[PDB]
Amino acid sequence: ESNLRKAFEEAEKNAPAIIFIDELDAIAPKREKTHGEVERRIVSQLLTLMDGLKQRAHVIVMAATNRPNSIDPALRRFGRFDREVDIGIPDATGRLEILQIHTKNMKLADDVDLEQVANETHGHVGADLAALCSEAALQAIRKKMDLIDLEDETIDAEVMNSLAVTMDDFRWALSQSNPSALRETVVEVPQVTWEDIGGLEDVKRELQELVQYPVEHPDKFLKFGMTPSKGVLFYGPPGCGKTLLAKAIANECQANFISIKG
Amino acid sequence: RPNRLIVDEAINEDNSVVSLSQPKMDELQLFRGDTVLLKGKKRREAVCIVLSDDTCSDEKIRMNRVVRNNLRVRLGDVISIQPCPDVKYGKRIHVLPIDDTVEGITGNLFEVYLKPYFLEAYRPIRKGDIFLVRGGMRAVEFKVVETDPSPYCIVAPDTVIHCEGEPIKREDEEESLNEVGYDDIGGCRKQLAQIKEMVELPLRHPALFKAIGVKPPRGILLYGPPGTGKTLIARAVANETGAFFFLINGPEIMSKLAGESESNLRKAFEEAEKNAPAIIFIDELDAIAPKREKTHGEVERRIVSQLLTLMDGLKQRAHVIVMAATNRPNSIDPALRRFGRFDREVDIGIPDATGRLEILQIHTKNMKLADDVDLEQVANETHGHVGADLAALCSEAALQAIRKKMDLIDLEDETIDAEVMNSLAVTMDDFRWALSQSNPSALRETVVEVPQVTWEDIGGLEDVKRELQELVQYPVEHPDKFLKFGMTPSKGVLFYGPPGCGKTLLAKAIANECQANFISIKGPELLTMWFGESEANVREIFDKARQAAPCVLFFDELDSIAKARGGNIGDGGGAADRVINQILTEMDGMSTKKNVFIIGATNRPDIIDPAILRPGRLDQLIYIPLPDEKSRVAILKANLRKSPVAKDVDLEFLAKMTNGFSGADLTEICQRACKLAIRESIESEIRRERERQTNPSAMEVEEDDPVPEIRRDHFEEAMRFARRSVSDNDIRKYEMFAQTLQQ
Amino acid sequence: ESNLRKAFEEAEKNAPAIIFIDELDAIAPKREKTHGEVERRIVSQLLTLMDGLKQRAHVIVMAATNRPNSIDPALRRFGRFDREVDIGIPDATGRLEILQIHTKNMKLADDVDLEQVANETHGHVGADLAALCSEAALQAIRKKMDLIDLEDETIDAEVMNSLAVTMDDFRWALSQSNPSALRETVVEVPQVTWEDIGGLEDVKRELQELVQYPVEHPDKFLKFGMTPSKGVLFYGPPGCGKTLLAKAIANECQANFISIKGPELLTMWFGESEANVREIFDKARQAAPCVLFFDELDSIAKARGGNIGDGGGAADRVINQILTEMDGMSTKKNVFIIGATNRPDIIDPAILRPGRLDQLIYIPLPDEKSRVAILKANLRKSPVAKDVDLEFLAKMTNGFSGADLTEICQRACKLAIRESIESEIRRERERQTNPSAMEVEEDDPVPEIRRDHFEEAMRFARRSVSDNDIRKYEMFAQTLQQSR
Ligand SMILES: Nc1ncnc2c1ncn2[C@@H]1O[C@H](COP(=O)(O)OP(=O)(O)O)[C@@H](O)[C@H]1O
Ligand SMILES: Nc1ncnc2c1ncn2[C@@H]1O[C@H](COP(=O)(O)OP(=O)(O)O)[C@@H](O)[C@H]1O
Ligand SMILES: Nc1ncnc2c1ncn2[C@@H]1O[C@H](COP(=O)(O)OP(=O)(O)O)[C@@H](O)[C@H]1O
Ligand SMILES: Nc1ncnc2c1ncn2[C@@H]1O[C@H](COP(=O)(O)OP(=O)(O)O)[C@@H](O)[C@H]1O
């Protein structure tokens, strides 16, 4: 508690300060999880300091947690942490931007297809991509260990600028790498277009009426009196094109898609 | 009472002088140069020097503006004056200037202003006094914050003063003890009325209550969802009656240090004992006194027992009232409910539509709204909100107005401060955005409120309305006749009929007519509470129905129990019987004193358990037939309000044609017609759209968009998709059951 | 522990004294709930101090607790707490006495009826009655703030003697008040007497035989060595008044009446079965003599036989616990057990065994003169007008049960209430236009329920008991008469 108090009182004097409580769930877990008494004292100290923060020099507190149900429920009353912003797993394009950010200094060979690797790899987060790139660089540099290996002065930039990391090193690094996300619900924009399906000409019209109009022209709906429909149920022979229809309408309406299986 | 005195303008301009009339002067036995205590509003004191004046009337006291600001009063108010002959000479004071008085002075205040004013002055001072000093060219305002002795001292030649320090603000943030009267609460009329009723006497007049010899209340519980404004209620009551509001916070008391926590709590109680009629507020009571089995360590038990002992130690003592706030009534240790401790329970619920409108009207006071705000719909589209959410909504609306405006390359010279708020306003789009980007916190809380469906919304059904108003209206409006004649009123009514005939409409209509609360327990929740939790949920729902009387508790889809019971599973039968049996046991425990009316509705009466249909329980059976003729016309008219009905056409033939149709079919037809009309309007708009793209500058003039042409043809095409919701054989089964009922 | 030791030591040296320990369970709970280590030390220290009272002085220790099962069972050996005294919730006469005691000081105007207030407050305890009186007094004071000068100092004397508390204040205090007992078993002598029952004289004789003689003159039974029957089982058509006979015989014997209904039994199927039944039998034994009543005894088999087959285990739980705690009972503490059921064929044969419920009494449907008797019974508290022939109504209603006749009796009074209110509304419609134009003085119409009310009630009616059920019971009775 002395450390917490010292941290807050030090941060409040330096003017527009931004405190960051990393790993919040480690010190303020769910109520029934705690067993001893020091944890209760620490949690109450944090709560009373948060309540005692009154305006000050515009100090702002951000806390990072894993899932928004492990922290104590008391840290959501008005005045305390109230705004929740999620950071989802990057999907499709996001992996491309992450890879292009990390593979900045290294001189890639002209045959490298970063887009293909981004499309192939899923269930990975930023740290996994960074580790993959690092392992690729080391794999590239090990096979050419005839450079100096003796000189106490580090390698001259000359030969070190003659390293073209190829697709083979990237594939090898991708092979021997275990992902971490895996079993996580995926929220993304499916890429299926209204050309993947060929038939169902009037079902397209029906879905268009049910979906697109409420978000385009709410004024006429609210004036005329109707409440817009909230659900649609599909039925027919097994297979056919139900899932493609759902993905296509989600793509056209430009909104996220969440799938739950039987 | 020869102490009340209306205020009046003063003759002389000296700060520490008030002019008194000779008759009162001799009546009160005052002399020249003495000191008296002046008490005003909002718990403000003042020390002055009595001066004689024949011009001033007896009822009027001559006093200047500085003392009026210090006492926070105005002309025509009443101020009590009391002699203060026990003044103690001071030894050291601290004086500081206000923020907006020393702009570009840069000099020593001791000699320029303090020395000329304080020489041979003998002016007494008190904490919180604001006084003005006249010198060369500026009116210097000074604040005295520290003195010895406090708060009474007199300036003497053998005294030391200090004026070294930063220019203090106007009043910092000390607005709470001046603001939050009854003008700052909305949508809590009944609870505030009850608190004022049961708290005014022990706090306003202690002497009479002592003389009578009756025990006052010693504890009040205010339980409700967080952010509904309980501490604000306590602050308003304490600040209005006049007391020593002394707040105790839960978490800070918990984690002070190891075993010294109870020392602080005992010190708080001791301080509150010595200091006049006071209110003690304990916030987050569940955080320090949870259930006994829940507690794991030993310090928590020590704290709980210390609280209990200090509570039971309030025998007589003084006029101290303890108020506590908690989230859930069952989360408190049941030991804190015995007589003598917290016994009176007051429920602060979620605000309703009118309450939301009142809260919004209160908060949007500093902001200068535009002439387009109609807060009625903004209030009525925010179901599931509390006070804090609405305050945050107003703040975000102001910030978004700033965003839509911005300090456009405006160099922040601090010059653009007042024209910021005095140039702007708010428009619908900002509030619609804030509503869109909002996080409600109530959601899953049972709502208690008077429904707004009236008798006109339903159509026909004269006999059923007559019977319901017979069974509900008479016993509550003329109970004397029943008591004198000696009869027991009926307690329940069961509705049975084909689905979609308008049972919940009728229940809400009678709830509106009776002007009583309404609670709805839908089928899915009832089916959920089988698997475990078959005692608790029923307990609190019945308790909530009882405490908020009058109300008409509604049980919908009562047959779902045995409907899910029958099947290929046969495992919810024990759950079914336990749920029905808690329902029955709680129903038989009702007392006629409370006007709690039970109504159950079902569409499959042949399956209901026969034990329900007994005297004392749900006994009367009322059959709702399918609408016919005039009922169909009435429901078609009821659904025909809308905004865009245009002039339209007759509705008689539509009612004449359909035979075997319920309300669901008519509402479906009404929705279909509007859907067709909207589709036509949008395709016409798209036609105009791509014809403008084909021909640029073709419609530079703003030609009117297509009107709401809800035509006969659109209606005839839309209702062409007419569906028969109900079959035919069910009518025969219902009528056979009805004929079985009659004998 | 120093405080406890000092307390007993100080009481030791100050003459015959009484030590009162309040909230005993808060310091000595069961050893299973004792989680820490300090509480075990406290309880052991208390036990040693208690056992150290050999001679010493004449010190008597009294303790108070809520749940008698919540105390550590170690505090029940001889030498320690051994005597058990139960303070129950007051009944109607007790409530009237409490109200009389707590209103001694105040001045009551000659309109309050304390009997009505006593009858309208079931479920309260003493503290609630005291709070009710206090709230009524405060309301009376607040209504008359004008007379009393609040001013600046003490009140006067004649003003206080001038205040009167009226019935309106009591009703207002009742409205804003919630009781505290509610969900508690009630042990009270019922108020129904013999005259409240129509017919059934032979059954009255049999019940009087099987309850009164063994308690009225136990000396003769001791001399002759008869073992009185422990239980009696009633069986017959529904709604013919079995509970009424039970309550009436309990009143005539002047013994406590404890009723257990079907809902409580089925709730105590799932989970809590042994503890509830044991507690019920313990409570029955403590307040002896009493007539314990079991109602809807057939609900066991009614719910057991269906499409579920999961409630049978707990049904056996309840029946087995009842048998176990019934056969091993002492009749010296008079506890007469009565069961009632309308589905006698499915009742478990183990119950119908000597030592258990053996005697079987059939309650017929009231017929002929019994109809006149019951209509006389139900028209003792209703101002029926003297123009209706009860004889023809009795002789028209062949094959009708008591509940049906009570419903018919109340229907006509409903018609009377609606007619009176309609007449009053019409009257208010008239004389609100002509100001006080009534040459003839007429009060509110006197209750004058005439023949047409009963004729209209009779037109729309019921025949609750079915004909096939009668012959089913007759066949069961003949089977019992012949096979057994
Ligand atoms: N244009 C199309 N029309 C119909 N079916 C298609 C089309 N394109 C692909 N399919 C096939 O239809 C199948 C849809 O079945 P699937 O989504 O697995 O389950 P569901 O029965 O829920 O649709 C896909 O496996 C896909 O191979
Ligand atoms: N009339 C009102 N009803 C409910 N809440 C209000 C009202 N007026 C203001 N509030 C909000 O209530 C807040 C203070 O209450 P709060 O401290 O949240 O109570 P609690 O601590 O019991 O949740 C203020 O920030 C204010 O925005
Ligand atoms: N008097 C009436 N007669 C027929 N239908 C009505 C009447 N009043 C309203 N309705 C319509 O019938 C519907 C009634 O639905 P609801 O009562 O919830 O179903 P249920 O009758 O199964 O409870 C409502 O949508 C309403 O628009
Ligand atoms: N003398 C009587 N004979 C039969 N029934 C009566 C008599 N007096 C009253 N009743 C009615 O019988 C009801 C009580 O019957 P009860 O003993 O519960 O039989 P069951 O257990 O079959 O329902 C009361 O509601 C009362 O209205």
Numbering used by the authors:
A (entry chain F): 283 to 544
B (entry chain D): 22 to 764
C (entry chain B): 283 to 766
Show passages lifted from the paper.
Endoplasmic reticulum–associated degradation (ERAD) maintains protein homeostasis by retrieving misfolded proteins from the endoplasmic reticulum (ER) lumen into the cytosol for degradation. Transitional ER adenosine triphosphatase (ATPase) (VCP/p97 in vertebrates and Cdc48 in yeast) was identified as the primary energy supplier for ERAD and has been shown to power the defolding of ubiquitinated proteins via its interactions with the heterodimer Ufd1-Npl4 (11–14) and the deglycosylation through its interaction with N-glycanase 1 (15, 16). In humans, Derlin-1, a homolog of yeast Der1, was found to form a tetrameric channel with a central tunnel ~10 Å wide, indicating a protein channel mechanism for retrotranslocation.
The p97 hexamer twists as D1 and D2 oscillate, and with the same moving rhythm driven by the p97 NTD moving back and forth between the up and down conformations, the Derlin-1 channel changes its shape and size of its central tunnel and the distances from protomers γ to δ and α to β. Superposition of the structures using protomer β as a reference molecule revealed major conformational changes around the N terminus, the loop between transmembrane helices TM4 and TM5 (loop L4), as well as helices TM1 and TM2. These results showed that the Derlin-1 channel switches between a tightly closed state (tightDerΔ-p97Δ, state T) and a loose state (the major conformation shown in Figs. 1 to 3, state A). The root mean square deviation (RMSD) between states T and A was calculated as about 2.56 Å, suggesting a moderate conformation change. This dynamic change could result from a coupling between the p97 ATPase activities and the channel action during the substrate recognition and retrotranslocation or a passive motion in response to substrate passage. S10, while the α and β subunits of Derlin-1 exhibited similar overall folding and arrangement of central tunnel residues, the δ and γ subunits in state T adopted a conformation closer to the center, resulting in a tighter overall structure. At the same time, the NTDs of p97C/D are relatively flexible upon ATP hydrolysis in their D1 domains and thus act as “rotors” in driving the conformational change in the Derlin-1 channel. This leads to a transformation between states A and T, whereby an intramolecular rearrangement of the transmembrane helices occurs, resulting in a twisting or squeezing movement of the central tunnel. The relatively smaller actions in the state A to T transition may serve to extract the substrate from the ER membrane. Moreover, conformational changes in the p97 NTDs, driven by its ATPase activities, further tighten the Derlin-1 channel (state T) until extensive conformational changes in p97C/D ultimately tear the channel into state U.
